[PDB]
Design a protein around this ligand. Structure first.
Ligand SMILES: [Ca+2]
Ligand SMILES: [Ca+2]
Length: 279
């Protein structure tokens, strides 16, 4: 299948070279898999989700996304027009408030929730969790991410936006999950993107068009936008049966575009997420 005039990031993950505008993908499109988006919530009623999204847990007075951030990330995972896995099932878990902030205890609670809740859902192709959030180092937050990964969920987390070594941030610094850096449309490291040996893979993160609250769309930037590209790609490959939850991150690194990125510091991987599609 092919989506013409796609957002540059979708085109980028289905090509060996930058500058294309068509997104090439297998029609199965992540059907049978599930992605938990752990964020500010999801505007499930957005037409772009086609009824495939729902809120399953909130830690505040309401389950509604009053911010937009979670709705944006979810759209890159699996909205019709802006998403990687266009037929996946999306589940929203609201651990961030409408200012985009959250306590570490609440974030940990949300991760333990997903590990248990997945046993009540029908997801025959597998389960992914996408975490576009983070802060200063904390061994409790890392340990929750590793629990989630170990229970059989593919965990993808943002490297962080400090142009620094991600070793000082959590859950980015947990080695057992998939830590995602950001690139721009010219195959440069995004100027804000963290780096370091703990990074596993890069995704498109500068100028990413996606769904927004109020039934709208908007373009924003961050390792927050690179993370759902990878979470979506994992769900897509799991549905195709190429890989499992436990080994998806490594399979994505193995099959990536290598050496394509510029301004990568010595000691950081030069790997860009790639779907290897061939018609
Ligand atoms: Ca190339
Ligand atoms: Ca890792």
């Amino acid at each position: 299948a092919a989506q013409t005039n796609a957002p540059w990031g979708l085109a980028r993950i289905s090509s060996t070279s930058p500058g294309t505008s068509t997104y090439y993908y297998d029609e199965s499109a992540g059907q049978g898999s599930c992605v938990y988006v752990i964020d500010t919530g999801i505007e499930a009623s957005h037409p772009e989700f086609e009824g495939r999204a729902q809120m399953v847990k909130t830690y505040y007075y309401s389950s509604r996304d009053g911010n937009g951030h979670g709705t944006h990330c979810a759209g890159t995972v699996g909205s019709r027009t802006y998403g990687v896995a266009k037929k996946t099932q999306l589940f929203g878990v609201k651990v961030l408030d409408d200012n985009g902030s959250g306590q570490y205890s609440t974030i940990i609670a949300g991760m333990d929730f997903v590990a248990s809740d997945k046993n009540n859902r029908n997801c025959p192709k597998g389960v992914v969790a996408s975490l576009s959030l983070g802060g200063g180092y904390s061994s409790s937050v890392n340990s929750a991410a590793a629990r989630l990964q170990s229970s059989g969920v593919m965990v993808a987390v943002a490297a962080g936006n400090n142009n620094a070594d991600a070793r000082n941030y959590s859950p980015a610094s947990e080695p057992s999950v998939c830590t995602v850096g950001a690139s721009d449309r010219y195959d440069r490291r995004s100027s804000f993107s963290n780096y370091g040996s703990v990074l596993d893979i890069f995704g498109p993160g500068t100028d990413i068009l996606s769904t927004w609250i109020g039934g709208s769309t908007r373009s924003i930037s961050g390792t927050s936008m690179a993370t759902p590209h990878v979470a979506g790609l994992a769900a897509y490959l799991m549905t195709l049966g190429k890989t499992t939850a436990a080994s998806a991150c490594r399979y994505i690194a193995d099959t990536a575009n290598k050496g394509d990125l510029s301004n990568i510091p010595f000691g950081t991987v030069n790997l860009l997420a790639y779907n290897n599609y061939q018609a």
